[PDB]
Amino acid sequence: IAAQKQKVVEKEAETERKKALIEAEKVAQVAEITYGQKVMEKETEKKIS
Amino acid sequence: EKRISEIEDAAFLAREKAKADAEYYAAHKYATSNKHKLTPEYLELKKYQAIASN
What we know:
2 chains; A: about 50 residues; mainly alpha; 1 helix; B: about 55 residues; 2 helices; elongated; Erlin-2 (chain A); Erlin-1 (chain B)
């Protein structure tokens, strides 16, 4: 029974790993958009200055 | 953030130039006004006030 529960646990851990990688990619893209926005903000701040 | 810092440097440099010119103009008008206000009598009055202040 343990020899099969091993594979089951391995597959569940792999699923968790894939989900974590997807979340990391999400955060990376969101950060990219946010920092483009920040650059635009600072350009406008220079105009205001 | 490096790009943002470059933008900040561009903005800060111009702001400090404006402050420099504003101070330069004020000093020039102060300087040209002194040639009338700063007379022997005004200096004597200021001397009295400063010496006897405290």
